[PDB]
Write a protein that binds this ligand. Structure first.
Ligand code: PF0
Length: 167
């Protein structure tokens, strides 16, 4: 049993809810919250901007030190950093950004990072401002992630469409 509440069960391991990921993290304090980051860990907008704002910019300060030491992530890659006030850990995962022309096949590689963690609170990778079709992102998630993932979808009209269209 875990603390996640109000989710619809899609599969053995994937759950979904219409929720603001920031508000969900603040309530649950999950072991892992996933950030939809860019390779530079520049948390300017969408999930990354909202998460970073909720940490009072501490996420960005930590991320700048990570990049200064290690250089940029790979598209499809990840790093584990602090969850600050939101979670124990933040898994920063880089899905491909369609609005930059990145290979959508890298979305499966991005979701494979989730398999290193038993339970996660996450957004749909590569969707929203990254340009991908969220229906596609949910299908890749279900077909890639084997660990227990609790998906938070901010957009109400999109949540209802993801559920209604789910195969
Ligand atoms: C996945 C997504 C969209 O495709 C569009 C707007 C918000 C979101 C979100 O849940 O963050």
């Amino acid at each position: 049993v875990n603390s996640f509440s109000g989710y619809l069960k899609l599969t053995d391991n994937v759950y979904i809810k219409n929720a603001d990921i920031v508000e969900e993290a603040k309530k649950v304090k999950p072991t892992v919250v996933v950030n939809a980051a860019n390779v530079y860990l520049k948390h300017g907008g969408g999930v990354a901007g909202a998460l970073n704002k909720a940490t009072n910019n501490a996420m960005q300060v930590e991320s700048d030190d990570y990049i200064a030491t290690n250089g940029p992530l790979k598209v499809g890659g990840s790093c584990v950093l602090s969850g600050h006030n939101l979670a124990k850990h933040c898994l920063h995962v880089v899905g491909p950004n369609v609005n930059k022309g990145e290979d959508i096949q890298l979305l499966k590689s991005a979701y494979e990072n989730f398999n290193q963690h038993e339970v996660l609170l996450a957004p749909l990778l590569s969707a929203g401002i990254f340009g991908a079709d969220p229906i596609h992102s949910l299908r890749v998630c279900v077909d890639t992630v084997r660990t227990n993932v609790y998906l938070a979808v901010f957009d109400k009209n999109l949540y209802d469409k993801l559920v209604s269209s789910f195969l």
